[PDB]
């Protein structure tokens, strides 16, 4: 269960990994095969926003829907 304080103290090089491990299973529940791709897309967003998404299903849904729209337009 991730706070901003715990994430920011981790080495910048492992922060995205910590967020990914938490985001991927949440996304996989919506998109069972596209979860890795969508997670990769979302990981480019600021960590502050990503932390909010982990705690708020509605914010995560809206970002996932945005990634899927983008993928739909690229084949």
């Amino acid at each position: 269960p991730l706070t901003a304080s715990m994430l920011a103290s981790a080495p910048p090089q492992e922060q995205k990994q910590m967020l990914g491990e938490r985001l991927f299973p949440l996304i996989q529940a919506m998109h069972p095969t596209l979860a890795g791709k969508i997670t990769g897309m979302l990981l480019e967003i600021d960590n502050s926003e990503l932390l909010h998404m982990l705690e708020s299903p509605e914010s995560l849904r809206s970002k996932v829907d945005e990634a899927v729209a983008v993928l739909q337009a690229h084949q």
């Binding site: 890795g36 791709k37 979302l42 990981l43 480019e44």
Partner: peptide, 15 residues
Amino acid sequence: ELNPNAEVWGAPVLH
């Protein structure tokens, strides 16, 4: 804006 070319996260490296 999100990037459609962002890499697949968590894909295992095997042969």
